[PDB]
Design a protein around this ligand. Structure first.
Ligand SMILES: COC(=O)CCc1cc(CNC(=O)c2c(OC)cc(O)c3c2OC2=CC(O)=C(C(C)=O)C(=O)[C@]23C)c2ccccc2c1
Lengths: 258, 11
């Protein structure tokens, strides 16, 4: 049983590496300055943003950039989900439901991998935009950016690696209590096994942190409240900003969400 | 019929 849980953990990690180009390992190699690759271009104000356009209203332009990356990330997450044993055999409408309610929780999680207290890696690590530049963006855009860093700081304190994250993300996707699911048990059964794989992963990979599994279960709960607030912050933008356009994929995900 | 469904069905 345990051997099979480790094989599952490895399968998920290998799929995670195929599905997500910029891993936390690669990202930390960039942020700490340990890569043979040339440094990311730092964007900290309007002037540096202008200069680095080829390397990578201003607030609206940055928001659209976030949208384009989110659309790309949704497609990466979808490919990863399809690698989770049993997922593609679920009712197709349930697969859609799991992604609809799952993707933004996963994006919050995976953004953390690319973030430190000072900023976020963008354009596959070719750019680095500072937290304070993003927070300084005029209302209501500044307050849309900051919560992602606030979560990242707390989440990164857990010191998870890519192997941990692969299973954590899989558990989140296979949540049997998403609104409107038709066949709950097959999803719950997959999640129960993924949760066993996660517990064993954390016991072996973080032996001196017994609390980690319980904390991660709480983070899954926290992410729901975080994403609800994210959806509210988007309404302060979408409803008030007249020339604001949402990408069709994102419009679909946000439509009738909760 | 949706974009998520189309992404899910692509091999
Ligand atoms: C819960 O999920 C969410 O909240 C998702 C939304 C979400 C997505 C991100 C990630 N943002 C980025 O990677 C990014 C960026 O970050 C500020 C600037 C930026 O300038 C560009 C970015 O990526 C880009 C893609 C493009 O194609 C562009 C072009 C060609 O125009 C860009 O402009 C780029 C280079 C967030 C990053 C930090 C904070 C909140 C975020 C929210």
């Amino acid at each position: 049983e345990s051997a099979d849980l480790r094989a599952l953990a490895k399968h998920l990690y290998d799929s995670y590496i195929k599905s997500f180009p910029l891993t936390k390992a690669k990202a930390r190699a960039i942020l700490t300055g340990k890569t043979t690759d040339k440094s990311p271009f730092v964007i900290y104000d309007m002037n540096s943003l202008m200069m680095g356009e080829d390397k990578i209203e201003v607030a609206i332009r940055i928001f659209q950039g976030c949208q384009f990356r989110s659309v790309e990330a949704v497609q990466e997450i979808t490919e990863y989900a399809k690698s989770i044993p049993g997922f593609v055999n679920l009712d197709l409408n349930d697969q859609v439901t799991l992604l609809k309610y799952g993707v933004h929780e996963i994006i919050y999680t995976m953004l953390a991998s690319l973030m430190n207290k000072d900023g976020v890696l963008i354009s596959e690590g070719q750019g680095f935009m500072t937290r304070e530049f993003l927070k300084s963006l005029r209302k209501p855009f500044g307050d849309f950016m900051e919560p992602k860093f606030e979560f990242a700081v707390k989440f990164n304190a857990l010191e998870l690696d890519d192997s941990d994250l692969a299973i954590f993300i899989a558990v989140i996707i296979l949540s049997g209590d998403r609104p409107g699911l038709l066949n709950v048990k097959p999803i719950e059964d997959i999640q129960d096994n993924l949760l066993q794989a996660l517990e064993l992963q954390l016991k072996l990979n973080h032996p001196e942190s017994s609390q980690l599994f319980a904390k991660l279960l709480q983070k899954m709960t926290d992410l729901r409240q975080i994403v609800t607030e994210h959806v509210q912050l988007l309404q302060v933008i979408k409803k008030t900003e007249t020339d604001m356009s949402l990408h069709p994929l994102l419009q679909e995900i946000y439509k009738d969400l909760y | 019929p949706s974009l998520l469904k189309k992404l899910l069905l692509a091999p």
